[model samples]
Structure formats: C-alpha cells, structure tokens
Target: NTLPEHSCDVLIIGSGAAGLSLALRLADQHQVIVLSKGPVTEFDETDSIDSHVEDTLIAGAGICDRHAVEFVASNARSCVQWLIDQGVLTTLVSKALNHPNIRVLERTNAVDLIVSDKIGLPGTRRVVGAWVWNRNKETVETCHAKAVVLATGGASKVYQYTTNPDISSGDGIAMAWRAGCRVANLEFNQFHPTALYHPQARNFLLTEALRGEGAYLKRPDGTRFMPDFDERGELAPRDIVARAIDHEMKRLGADCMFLDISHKPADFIRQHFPMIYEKLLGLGIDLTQEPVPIVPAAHYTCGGVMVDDHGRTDVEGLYAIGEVSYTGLHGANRMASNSLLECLVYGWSAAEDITRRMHDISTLPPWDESRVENPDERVVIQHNWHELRLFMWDYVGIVRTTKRLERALRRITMLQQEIDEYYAHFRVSNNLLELRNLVQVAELIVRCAMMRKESRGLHFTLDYPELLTHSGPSILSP
Candidate 1:
C-alpha cells in the first residue's frame, strides 16, 4: 500500500465557490481534481427571476421546493453571468490555478466516499474514489475519480458560535451520509443575526448591510430591541433577527447584544462600512462611535446532501454542490444572496451534469495504516471537539425543544460511541476527521430537530410553537 495515488476526470471535494465553480466548469473538458481542505485562497446581486422567485418563496417559510425555487431562480442571472464570465474575469482561485485541466489539492483532506458497494465493486453502487487526508504528506491519499464532487462547505462548524471557516465541518454532509445520501432540511440551521461580540473579535460578521444602513439592535441598556421583535424592525427575517437575538440573550441574562450604528453619520459610518469600518477600528470597536457587541452566530447550513436538478447525489457519480447540496433552494429559510446563488447555480448545474457523463478509475484501495496508533491523547481530540461545539450551542441552538431535541440526541449517541472507538484505534487526524464529521452532522441536526413538530423556517420549536398546516422536507435516510 504505497498510499499516494491520484487520478481525475472530476473529483472536486471542495475549494469553495462550489468547488471552484465545478473546477472552472470541468476544467474545459474534465480531468479536474480540486480538493483543498486548506490552502487555495481567493475568493452577487439579484432581482426578478420572478421577483427572485417571490423572495425565495417568502423566505422558505412554507417549505420552499417550488421546483427548487424555480430551479435556482431560473438560473440566477445566467449563473451570475457565468460566474463573472468564468472566474470573476480572472480570479476564481486564479482561474482554478491557471487551468490546463486543473489539479489543486493543497493540503487535501477528503477521508471518505469510495463507494462501489463499499469496495466489493458489484454492479450498481457508484462513486469511484476518494479517501484523501494528505495534509502535506502526513499520509493517506488515493483519489481516483471519474466524477465525484461534494463541494464540502456547511454545518457551521456544528456551532459554539460560528461564522464558518475552520472548514465548516460536516465534511460533505458527513461524507454524503456515509456515502448513501438523502439529507434534506437538517433542521434549517441559519442563525446569523449579528456575530462580532469580541474576545479579540470571534468571527466578526455584523453586516445585514448593517441593518440596511441604519442599524440599532441595542440592549446593554442602550434600549431598542428590534421593535419588540419584528415589525420589520432592524429589517427582520434572519429567522426573526436570530430569534430576537436569541430571545434577548436568554431574557436579559445578557452576555452580549447591541449593534447601534452610532446614530449614523460618522462620515456616514465611514461611508458605509469600509471593511466594517476598518475591521471595527482594529477591534477597539469605534464603529462610528459605540454600541457593538452583538451575538447570534452559527450562520448557515439550511440542510444538505439530498440533491437533484443536476447536483446529482444518491451516489452514482456523487456530486453535492456548495454548502454541501440539498438544493431545494434553501427551503426552510435562506435568502440573502442565496448563498452565492446556491454556489453559482450548483456550479453551473454540476458542470452541466459532469459534461453529460463523459467519465473509469475503479481501482481504488489504499488508506489502511496498518494497525493504527498515534492518538494516545490529543486531549481526547480536544475534549471531543469542545463537547461537540458546546452541546451544539446549548442543545440544538437558536432555540429548540422536545427536551432540547432529546438532549441533543443523548449527547449524539454518546459522541457516536466515543467517536467510533476513536475511529477504531486512532491515527487519522485533522481533528479526528472533524470530530467524525461533527458527530455525524450532530446526529443529523438532532434528527432534523426531532422531525419538525412545527414552527417553520429555521425549525424553531419550544415544542412546535405553531404553524404546521402540513410540512415537508425533513427527509434523512442515511
């Protein structure tokens, strides 16, 4: 088992911008590669695709899938002008790193999806390769590929406050639900009402266009509480301003909350957030003059894996696009900039269905690492990744119930039996493959927030605070 093996006819795991816009749309005729669980840097307006499909079906409150919100709002303006005429006119990871049928890798990481009936290689079960990890020659590699793309991106790092980036673990929705698939409305995550609370600015976000240019959510006694929870106050809808800042920081036990645009005009807040007023004046926070703190973090996931209308999935050639798929166009809620317009309309319809299936790399077998050893105690994988992101932000966050989703599925089934016996005797790292895919996507987000009793969009609960009238996407499968 010499390890390092690599092939490609498409393999894309993720480099963002929906795996480099499907590796610059199949690196001009396939042989693409991508990966990048680390390096590969570089880095959306909308209107009338039928009023952006009626404002993403009134912000997905009635369970969006109106034909996947009119097929990503009728190809959101030609897949955003073909992603600015292919790679923002020169830099979408530097035209997929000076393409010539692309390659990329950078630190790698994948760790699963080999399929073909888990290597018995019978007739049907597809996906031909993956099992990466590389991290600059620290081992495990083998990426054959005749099509396989899980643009790994969301799970908001399974939350303890997140703005994402630490590679939003949920690694391709737990490796496309352990390579079987069917993930739907993972209890609609989303959160993002504010962020930037400080402690050297933890993932500082703060812009909802800074409350559409006026700003003010206040409450450290400076008053103003989103017009008593939504009269479109602070321009609502981010799951009602992140459930009114997580119900005023749990009924004023307050640790943070306040966003005030220092009553506008400090040169109009430095002429509208010039890089969030120079990164909140290098974190000393003088955004025009005061009130900054804020909270509601976890940002976005909006369920994933289950795909179609091009971003395939249920295995076959395996392809789950940006934010890891579930393309019912952000069903139970997800609007603002439609998450890079669903990663450039599912990376240009999964590179036009992987260039009409022009695809044979079926040799795959390697990553064994003899009898595994190394991790005697890396602080028990950093205390089970900080107890699975602080009990998934205190029991399935942004508010939920049914006994906090059965105590977060009984601590995610005892942290998935102690991370599956520490992944059967240790060795593979990268935070133990992102805490074994964030405790298998936090037990599929507490089993889709315990099969949604009600309270639509972003699965609010407190034991169904009302609004079912027949619901839909909670799916799951495995």
Candidate 2:
C-alpha cells in the first residue's frame, strides 16, 4: 500500500532469494526493510525434499553437517508450500515490490556496520544498524534497527570471470568480519561448469538444464570426455563437472570447450529453454545447429560470515542468511539448487528467532562524514579494483599452491593498507566500498586456503596433493 520505507524494525541487507523469502516471512508481524544493491531478479522451482537432502549431503563430500542438512530438508517443502499459500506467482514476485509490510530500498548499498559494544559485557556485542549509500540521492545514510539481517548473496565476483551479478562483492561478509565475526571455509569457492563463452555475453550463465535435457560436453574435435572423469558424466556434481572442464581445457590448451545439444529436437530446445536459445541466436550461435562454446567461472561463495542454527551471528541482533552466511548446509561444496533452498529454510528460521527477540531494539547515532572529502583520484579505485580481480583469478582461482596463496596474501595486504588509508581520507563511493570489501574477502579466502593443507571438494592444491585424514572447516576469527 505504501512505498517500501527506507528504514524499518529489521534491516535486511540483500534482496536475493534468501533476503526476499526472509522479508516476506517476517513482514506480516515486523516492519521489514530490504536493501538491494541492484534490481531484484528471480528464482527456480524444484522437486523432492528428502532426495534433495541426500543430494546435498553427497555433493558436500563428507564435510556437510548432517543436522543442518536435515533441518533444511525437513523445512524445505513447507517453505515452498508457504510460497504457494501466499499465491505469489513467480512473475508477480518481481512486480509485487510493494509488499505493504516489506519496504525495499533498491540501489542502496551497505558500507559499514554500526555496532554498540557498550550495551553488552566485554564478550557480548550488539549490532545497531549500518551505514549505507543511497544511490538515487548519491549520499551516505545511516539506518538503525532492532535486528540486522545480511542476505547479501556471495563473493564470487572477486574473480575476473564469474556468473554472479556485479553486486556480489562480499560486502556483507567483509562488514560482519570487520564488526568482529568469524568466517568459515572461505577457500571453497565453486565454479559453475558451463557459462556461455562469448565476447558479447561475458556473464551469461548457460543453465545446467541444458545438460539435463541431453546436451553433451564436447571437445573442439567433437569427442565426449565426461565419461572419462566420472561415471555420472554430464550428470556429475558441479565441482566434479567444473574440475573436469578445467582439466580438459588445460590439457588441450583450448580457449573453451563445447556443449552440444544439437541432436535434440529444435522444437524441444526452443520450448524448454527459449531465453537461452534466443540469447545464443543473437550471438550468432545456433544451438540447435551446432555446439555452443562454454567455460567454467566462479559461481558461488560456499563459505561466509559464520552463523549458528538460528541464523544468529556471534554478535547479537546481527543475523546472516542466504549466501552471506555459512550455515554448514553446503559444507565443503554446495549442491545444485540447494542455495535457494538454504535461503528459504534459514531465512524462515532467522525470522522465527528474530520475532521472539523483538524487544532488543535500540536506537543509535547516524553516519558521520566529518573528516571525509570527495575523492580526488578516482582512477586509484578503478586500478585497485582491476588489480584485485586479476590476481585472484590468476593466483587463487580454480586451483592454488602455497607460493600462489602467499603471493596473493602479500598483494592483498598491500592493497588493504592502501584501501584503508584511502577510506580514512575520501568519502565512501560504491566502487571504493566494493573494492575495500572484496580485498578483505580476498584476504580471508587466501588465509583460509593457507590453513587447510589438503585437497577437498573445491579447494584443490598441487602442493597438498592429498586429502587430509583429519578434515574440518577452515575457520578464521577477527
């Protein structure tokens, strides 16, 4: 009825699947404010819940917490069923922006957390709100809340190439860590196996449904190779599929591999994946006639600000849901479609937990811009941004080594120093803020990788070459 308010009882820092689901869950009772870094998009539907749980556990490769997996498994159907009961059609979800109780601030970005250590004893701390940049006004604003929920998606954008949207800069993870939270398994970044490889469609994600519909992973010569890597072949888990593609590309020295669904009926292809077919057609590649080129790209951040069963962080009134929080459901590697399920399951859980503690609301002071000035050299931010992505792609992406991790650590440490100095002087811009957060996340990724001295799921290393007998998550506390 009213335009989504700028501030509310709960400050939800993202608007992806987890964020939206959580907002909808809590909005009926609490005034919910949602901050989206960009315009909201869409989500996918799914099948059985128990089978989904089994798939998730298998995909995690033994590192998954069974309890978390079971929790999500049990609640998933009810969550999806809840969406059904809301009668919220997928098409309407985007346009239904005015969720009366859910106030959404599109184009706003959270820059820093505002915490009140004075409210609790030495060990306990509470989150007041956050310093955010309102894009339309091009100004910094502070919004305090009783509960702060970070639904900011993931940090896969640290790589030069990624399927994630531009906004996936690890902002929530970095901000939470800075406010004194621990992070887990930062090294386990997952690369999706088949992003459309084209100059024009740099970030276009080729849906795995293509493979499900009988697309073949081919070499330039038209030879099938997935069978050689895993018995499941095209149906293998993402990490396995991605690793196979990476290995093949390295061995062949090819720019990219091919995914051929040309044998499928033209009508079938068009009917099933109309958008993908049209997009490829615009790029002058007829998927119905020939194979489409594809490459693996960073797709998901499997680890992030660590949270417990209730989606509560170590810091009181601060919760992390969606990809921003490592709830241990994915463990070492996330299963396909599990991310969306986790978002709903955990988001609902967090809302239930937050509703009981609504009395913890406390007001705080607004953002201070006293000493900061407009940045003079904007190019410095641009240069640092490029440098960070390139090094991360080259040294710490897909594969790693002790030497490469060390090099990344040193470079990021230098960049962090420069970024910190720059932050102290210049006022916060979205670009500068994203770069600062990305670098912080990059450091965390490197540090976590260094601590885990074994090859497990996604964090592969030639130096270690073997899986450690005693394996657990690599956790780093601020």
Candidate 3:
C-alpha cells in the first residue's frame, strides 16, 4: 500500500530565516507548508546592502559573480523589511501560528526530492514534491507540490566542533546532489575566530562584536599577538584573525587562546553585550573581569547546491536558497553580514519567479516503503557519526594538506558504503538520514579541496600554497 499523501502549491524545506521569509512572501498568493527539522530559533541585525556587496567581493577574492553579487546587494533591504512585517526578531512560535495560509511542520525531516521526468512538461525533469519522515507521525509520507524551495542551510556540522546549531548537517546539499543537481565550492569552509572554548559550552559562539568593542586576542602567557600578524589586529577580517589564532595554537602547542575585554569599564561591557556577559557569567568566566578562552571552529559552508539569479537549480522547479546555495555571491569566502542578505534577496527573487509559474505543474506519486525494514542496530549510525567528525576535524579543518584530504576522502568512502547498506535495509530514522547526508557532504568538501590546487581565500593548503593567476569556482556535478 502507498504511504499517506498530501499536496500543496509550494513546499519549503527549511524553517530558518530564508524559509520563513519565503513562506511569508508566498502565503498571500499561494498555499504553502514550511518544514522545520527541529524547533526553530530565528536570528537577526544590520548594515548597508551596497557596502555588503563590496565587502563580499573583496572577501570572496576573485571567484564571486559580479552580476549575482549586485543582484543580492540591490534587494537585501526589501527582504529584511518583509521579515519585520512577519514579526520575526521577536518570534519563537507565536507569529507562525497566527498565519492563516501557512502550515508549520515541526520536527519533520525532508528525506529527498520527489523528482520524475514523466510529470509536468515532457523532458524538463521537474521537482514535483518530496518524501518526508514525520517524527511525530512515525510514518514516511509523500508531499506533492507545484514547486520545491530548499533553504536547508549549510554543512558546518560535518566537523567535530562548530559554531552552528545541530541542524546544519547539509541535508539539502546531499539531497540535491543525489537528485543530480550541480554543487560548487565545497572547499571554502570558513572558520570563525572565537567560539567559546569551554568544554561544556559545546556550540556557543562568542560574537565578533566583542572584538569590535576593543577586546584583544592574547596568548596563554598574556601576550598580545594580532599586531604581529596584521596591522589592523583584532579588527582584521575574520579569515585573517582565524588563521592567526590557528597559527598561535600550533606554534605554542597551546590548547586555546583568549579574547580579553576586561580592560573596558565593567558598566560598558555589561551594557554593550549583556547577553554575552550573562552567558559567560553562567559558565564561570566573567568577561568583565577576565579573558574568555576561545578557539577557531567550523562556522560556515560557502559552497553548496548551485543556483542561478532566480534561485533556480539545473532541475526544473527545484529552487535552492540561503546557506544551502552557491549563487556566486560568496565566492571563496563569505563576507560578514552578507549570508542573511543573500538568503533574503534570493527568497524574494525565487518567490517572484515562483508566483508567475505557480500553476504550470502538479502532482506526484505517494511515498513507497514496502521493501524496507526497521534497523537491527543503531550502533552503525552512532559509530560512523563520531568517526566522520573526528577525521574531518583532524584532516580537513582550518588548515589542510594534500595527504590529509586524500586520507579523509578514503575514510568517507568506506563510511558511505556502510551507510548505503544500512539505509537500504533499515526504515529511515533522523539519525540515519542525517548521517547519510553528512557523509555525502564530507565527500563533496574533500573532492572540491582536491580540485583546487592553489590556495585562495578560505581554502589554504600547504602542499599548494601559492595562489594561481587564473582561478574559477570549483563546481561538482552529480
């Protein structure tokens, strides 16, 4: 028997700022459903769009697309204003609940795109919908849609330590790759300079604004070091700061470095970053009194499922936006304050393009799970998850080497084989699904790293340390 089926005009496969913004834009004209992998905490803040564009061009080195950068820069403000209209930056769940045209599916994981060449116009290979595993329903179901928008964020969680939340497992990237969509630039992973270096505070990220407010990057011996690396010191761009800190840790054999803002007036520290102050206080390290331990942790995936000016991928009716996309706005590295800008601009653009073609396609076959069985043991999933993260961190982190990338590629291939076998036998679980996606993302990152011989932007490799005179984005097609 076929699994349960539901239909909508559009299916948005993420509940972050991008997905929510797109849902709000389309809710007025078309019926939509928004899927969240877990409970969502919406995020926010500022900066001029033109300035954002210029800074991104500089940060991306030479690989960014000028036209795409200009397009996002021009439209960022409108998307933010629309987000304000929806009551985000103040919402937990209240706002989404009140929307009449929207249905929010929490704790729901989208497994794969339901693409078939037989549907829609003869040869287009349109994406009609998706197969989803609803955690609450405990059933695998099919959702048919006229269009599918992927805003599933980045793959930063592939590492052992990261500034991103747990949901950043590269679901959309993996799904699109399996569906034969082209992906690009997986090598340029950005390492944030100051994630809190406490053993207990696993994913806490110390905001860069603390440094902007006159904090100093110091060694374990309390020596200031940024000036030795860059004239701008702590005020340097994040990539430089991260590299410098990484160098210090390796040179000194030190476990971590520190960021001290204690020199500032206690009142000013509290008033400027009250939330950071409180969180640190709870962790037994008071920022107003002493330096907080810090480390460079994986923070962003600059490359992902490739998309065009209108967020369109190679597969028709399948659109990808936000961190899950490589739209040429973020070339080798993403500029600060521009990630959300790209998300908003593309969400708006995709919405416009989608609205005009909303009626062109319809329907999909219901999900089928007749051949699968429950997993015999979850140890395979758990074991592979740990091994993958550890090897990725040790071999393919803020710094790299040809041998390390090769080693990582080999391990991920073996892990992929086991995961494929487990997936074929076991009925899908969120853990298995996420682990499967992560191994695929890990493979993509290593493959792209191997492709770019010369160091540029975030992809620095000691084996090929010089920058090539001519370079382009590293694109991988399935």
Candidate 4:
C-alpha cells in the first residue's frame, strides 16, 4: 500500500547522537524525520568516552591522525550543545557531568531507505526517506523526504564476540553499498580487549574506563605480565591490549583474565560506573568486592561507507555519517571517544549540506515493488548466519595465519553461494537481510586481511608476524 509519499525536507536514519543531532539541525527549516532501528536514548550514556579517547590515542601505536582526533573532540561539546538547543535533555548525572542533549527515537529502528533518481548518479539516487519499524507499534511504515542522512551506526556485529548491540549489523554500510555508495576497510574491525567474562553475560562490555580508573589486568593465577609487552600495560591501546589478553588466554588455557579496580573506594567506583556496577551486581559479581573477569570481544568498525570531510558519499545526493561511513578520521584503528565525536560533527555537517540542497531537486519518483515474493525456508539464512560467524572467529580473529586466511576464504566463498541462492528466491526478511549483509562484511574483512601480507594494527597474521617498514590501509574496490 502506498503510504501517501508522506513528505519531509530531510530524513535521518538512526536516533543515536549523530542522527538526533542532524535531525534537529534540519527540523526548523525542513520537516525532518528520523528512523531508529531500536531505542536510541538508552545507549546515550556509554561511559567509554574518556577511556575511549585516551586508549585510542595509545592504541594508535604512534600512527593515529591527531588532527582528526582534535576535530572530533572540539565538535563533541558543540554537538551536545546543539542537542541541548533542541529541547532534549540528558540528566547531568547520566553523562557523568558531561552535557546531554537531543530528542531520540527511544525504541525505534531504520529498516530501509526510500530513494529516488535525483541526488547524484544519473540514477542520482537522492534519498527520499526511509521505512522504520517501531517496537512499540509493532508496525512497519515508510517516511518520505527530499534528502537523507545515514547515521545508522556500523557493522561490528559481523563477529562472534562483540560489544555492540544487535543493531550494528553493517545495516548502513550494506544499505549504502546496495544503493551505490563507496565503502572501504570493512575488515579492520576494532575488537575490544576486555568484555565481562561470565559465559551467560556473553557480550557485556568491560569498557576501557576501568583501566583509566587504575584497573590492572591479571591472569587466573594473578600474574602481572604486561610489562613484558608495554610499560603502559592495561592502559595500552585497545588493539594491543586485546591482542595481549588474547595471547595470554591462548597460552594459559584460561577462560578469562581480570580487570581489578576493587582496591578503589566503592563510592568512587559506583559513581563512575553505576551501570557496570549494577550489571555486575546483577550477575553476582561486585566491583567493590572482587576483581571482575574480562575477555576480549569485537567492538568497532574502523572502515565504513566512504565519505568526504563534509560527510558526502560518492553518490551525490546521499550522505553517510557515524559508524557507517569511512570518514578517514579513524585510520587503521579508532581512537577512544573519537567515534561518538565523529558521529556528532559529521552527522550535523551532512544534514546541513543536505538541507541547503533540498529545494534544488525538481521532482521525485515513486517506489516500486513490482517483482518480489516472500519465501518459505528462512532456515537457510539462519544456518548461513551460524556458519559465517563461527569460521570468522576461528580464522579471521585476533591472530591469523596465511593458511587460516585461505581456509576462511574458501568457506566464505561457499557460504556466499548459499546466501546468494537463498536471496535470489526469497523476498528479503529482516533476519535474512542482516545475515546476508553480515556475510558480505565478513567477506570484505577476510579479503582485506588476505591482501595485507604483513601484520599491523588489528589485522595480524602469524605468516607475516612482523610489521612492514611502512604500512597503509589495504583498499579493495569493485
């Protein structure tokens, strides 16, 4: 059924800081509609901010882009201020005294974009709007607009162990790829070194903040060994710290290590990490009483849909921001807290650019669903999802070998065939769609890993264990 082509001036996918900030900027001059995949407000209070900023700098391993880091930090304050200007408020207590701002689609999701042949390519593909699914409504519908901003997060969910929510399934990256946008570095996923280590807790994150607060990482027998790698120890950048932890886990036949901060005052611990504190308490682990168990898990996507300094993708009328775009700010590995800052600055920049160009379009086109059918066996998708994540963990994980990469490539090719055949017959359901997208991301990651012969940053391999004299991003294209 046609949803009346409900028009708006600008459409933003995702209700995260980036999406919310951008949506507000366009709201006054243009009717703005923001599509979120799930509740946006609940996660606005992530504490990895300072730790993220500091460790990211340390992890840069002396190769981080300082100008880019500086650009994002300066703009984050402004972005939060902009959110405040929108009449959205975050409790000061919530942000740990950092400013809070912006109205968010607390429990929403952006499913797909509504695009027309006007933005850039002769197919121009100006984003018209998007179809969003709200859990509250349990209903799906489309929103129309003259311009669109893709702030829909990143593709961190492609890995088995991950700190991201299920929403980070390369949705924006995959959507832009399908819609003819350029993306890069899908393989250099930034894995977090310390996640809570209870089997049931699964992907619960042990944010780097604990280390900043003086937490020390220890093995099961309580051996202090980081000095062998770096004097900085637990404070090392995420990639180094994670790899170090991974090395120890492999060497010691241990399930997990420790991030001990219990020596600090309980009140100070509670004040700084109330969420982590409560979650741990619920799990029968208390920060005040004992050292918390921690393990490494995949966390951030360093590469994304390629965007310029102004956040425009190669596709003229389209813009991608946040974790979805390869803004070149996070070269190799992302620095702490820079990602949230990047979301704010570029999301707003993309929206501002889109709003100014909104009235220039002469006409819009209608969407067509002429040749499609829903399918019966979604079981194929679930199975493929299982296979892809398992082998990705096995071969393309923290450590790698040339033989392992080759084996992973062979399996990925086989799984890709299965996914391709299934997709050809089945009308895309969300699960099938995400599974397909994740496989694509997995392929890119492996392919990129194979292309890089030397180990450097996050893409390590036993075959070429040493870093080359000079290293660069391993770029791939269609």
**Best candidate according to lDDT:** 3
lDDT tens digits, residue span 231-347, model 4 = 788787677788788788777878788888877789999899999899999989998878888878777887888777678877666788888887766766765567777887897
State the lDDT of candidate 2 residue by residue for 283-383, as single tens digits. 99998999999988988888998988899998998999988889889988877778877888898899899999884444455555545555566777888
> Candidate 3: misplaced stretches above 4 Å?
1-4, 40-52, 84-95, 118-123, 218-233, 248-255, 262-273, 359-376
User: In model 3, what are the clashing residue pairs, if there are any?
Assistant: none
Per-prediction count of colliding residue pairs? 0, 0, 0, 20
- Model 1, 138-170: lDDT tens digits are 888787787888887788888878887655888
Model 2: weakest 10-residue lDDT segment is 1-10
Q: Residues 1-478, candidate 3, lDDT per residue (tens digit)? A: 2433767888999887788778888888888988888765442234465567678788889989989998887777677777676666434255655678888887889998977764333655778788899999887788878899999989988997788755488999999998889999999888888888987886788888998899999999999999999999999988889888988887898989999998889989989998989998998989888989998888888899999999999988899999999999989987777888888889889999999887444445655554455454676678788899988986788788999899999999998887666566576788888788999999999999999999999998999989999999999888
lDDT by candidate, in order shown? 0.81, 0.83, 0.84, 0.69
User: For model 1, which pairs clash?
Assistant: none
lDDT of 1 at 67: 90
* TM-score per model over all chains: 0.35, 0.87, 0.89, 0.78
Model 4 worst lDDT window (10 residues): 91-100
Q: Which run of 10 residues does model 1 get worst, by summed lDDT?
A: 41-50
User: Which is the better candidate, 1 or 3, if ranked by lDDT?
Assistant: 3
**Best first by TM-score, ranked:** 3, 2, 4, 1
Which residue pairs clash in candidate 2? none
